[PDB]
Design a protein around this ligand. Structure first.
Ligand SMILES: *C(=O)N(CNC(=O)c1ccc(Cl)cc1)CC1CC1
Ligand SMILES: *C(=O)N(CNC(=O)c1ccc(Cl)cc1)CC1CC1
Lengths: 313, 313
């Protein structure tokens, strides 16, 4: 069976925060933040706009791009680490707000790698024959869990959502290959502090792990598709660090003009990261039907995923 | 392909809390709690025992019962609304403590219904031919989110975990039929209050939903499996309210001695509820190879699940 992306949409909130903003509360600079991360601005949800609101905005665009009606959706999976509540889930709230039938809806947690975990989950369902139009969202409001007193993390993170309908697509298109994994030995390097409610990171260890796993997962998922570097039209890594993305690109062996970079405008958006990058490449006319794209990400867990997708219905 | 339960384990923590315990800080009695719920006691985890510890103990029992090795597990899925942290996940921590390879691991939120959601998730992965031994955990520490100042809810909830290995089983065994649903319009009737971090319930609306869905959904999957009342060996609903369980039982037209009752010793334990009842029926010798069991449940979301399963590997 050919299972792919029948429609796509992405949303970042209105409020844009520049690097210079942090200088009034923290010992940081534009020059420091830019050099180290490649981030120039990030988007932050308003106080009354939660993860579910970002998810909603991305999903309605996905459904219009898919040319289906809400009643066509036969399951909702939201990848988020920052759901409004553990119950009801962002997935539940979208069932109500999108006005779908009373279909199965759940949040899946794999941090930064969640969007890829959920798309793969959706694929398994569609391949059974029982599901035709599965809404997969990657949404994080990371601004809720950012320690604004820590210069090392306060500057990293922003908010957004992406969404795809996973269903049947035409011959040769869709999800060709995927790789998922985890390594709980790295949990202590990137976690949500149980007391403060804030993201805690051993940056140097996350860096070293990100460089290796991003390199490994992307080359492996290309080999599994029986493709080489030369067959890839776009490399779309999870957007967190320009150095990490560069290192992964070098391992894979593809040219810089072939790597999607949106970290400069969104910072890191966890599950929303890859979709916000895809949105940029669609609108700039760098991604079209029949292009072969490689996604890769790592996350707190530690988690990782990678997929080879041929673009189009 | 026949996909079912290769191995089963369950775990309730040591500390038993009787109905009389509540009298020292609430206006409750044994008879008041017993007439309302059918609850006599519940198990609460120690302060140094989180959802992952409960999940770990159910999982090792599940592995030994499956007669496999940790290196055989190709995916960990944990159904929980009370994971230690959103990242790393309970699934991530199990990847490490169980000593598995670096396999896909994720937590799935469908509240109360999560265990049923996640076994169905596991089934989709096995039916593809790429996964053979998927660990599925239903684990909640509801003690952590119980409002001990609200007599209505303080007495309802306890802690536990169940675990199955989902994989190939012999001719005619395993998951025969299922249904999974959600209705986000009921989100306001059962949720985690953002401010307190505690479960808030409109009891009337929840009871009305429970009664209707637990009868509609069990009946539908019995029908969907081309079976009737007499084919059912065990009815194992989510254990929470004995008047709600009896309502589902008589709507199925089934003998009292055919329903599993464990709410008397565990209270409601969310994703752990059905597995803790299965374990009691196993050790009491009420559940055997080729027995046809019916599962049904609802959760905050709202969510629901129902399945027909023929026992054994
Ligand atoms: C993703 O899993 N994630 C957010 N990203 C990071 O914490 C991160 C990105 C890049 C570097 Cl160098 C370090 C850390 C953490 C939890 C989902 C929120
Ligand atoms: C299940 O979703 N769950 C456990 N909680 C209940 O609120 C409940 C069960 C049964 C009855 Cl009759 C009433 C209430 C709620 C959230 C996952 C923890």
């Amino acid at each position: 069976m050919n299972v792919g992306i029948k429609g796509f949409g992405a949303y970042a909130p209105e409020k844009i925060i520049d690097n210079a903003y942090f200088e009034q509360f923290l010992d940081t600079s534009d020059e420091w933040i830019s050099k180290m991360t490649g981030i120039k601005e990030r988007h932050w949800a308003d106080d009354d706009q939660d993860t579910s609101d970002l998810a909603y905005e991305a999903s309605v665009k996905a459904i219009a791009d898919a040319g289906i009606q809400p009643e066509d959706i036969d399951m909702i999976i939201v990848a988020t680490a920052t759901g409004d509540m553990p119950f009801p889930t962002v997935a539940n709230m979208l069932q109500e707000r999108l006005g779908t039938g009373k279909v199965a809806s759940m949040d899946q947690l794999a941090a930064c790698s969640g969007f890829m975990y959920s798309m793969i989950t959706a694929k398994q369902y569609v391949q059974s024959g029982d599901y035709h139009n599965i809404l997969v969202v990657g949404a994080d409001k990371l601004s809720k869990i950012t320690d604004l007193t820590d210069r090392s993390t306060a500057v990293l993170f922003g908010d957004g959502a992406g969404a795809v309908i996973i269903g049947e697509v035409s011959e040769g298109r869709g999800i060709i290959s995927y790789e998922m994994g985890s390594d709980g030995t790295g949990g202590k390097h990137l976690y949500l502090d149980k007391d403060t409610g804030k993201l805690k990171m051993n940056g140097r260890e996350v860096f070293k792990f990100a460089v290796r796993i991003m390199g490994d997962a992307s080359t492996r998922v290309v080999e599994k598709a029986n493709l080489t570097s030369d067959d890839i039209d776009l490399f779309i890594p999870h957007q967190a660090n320009i150095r990490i993305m560069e290192s992964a690109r070098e391992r894979l062996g593809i040219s810089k003009d072939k790597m999607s970079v949106s970290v400069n405008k969104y910072g890191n958006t966890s599950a929303a990261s890859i979709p916000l990058s895809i949105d940029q490449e669609l609108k700039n006319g760098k991604l079209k039907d029949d292009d072969t794209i490689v996604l890769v990400g790592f996350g707190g867990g530690l988690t990782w995923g990678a997929m080879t997708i041929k673009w189009g219905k």
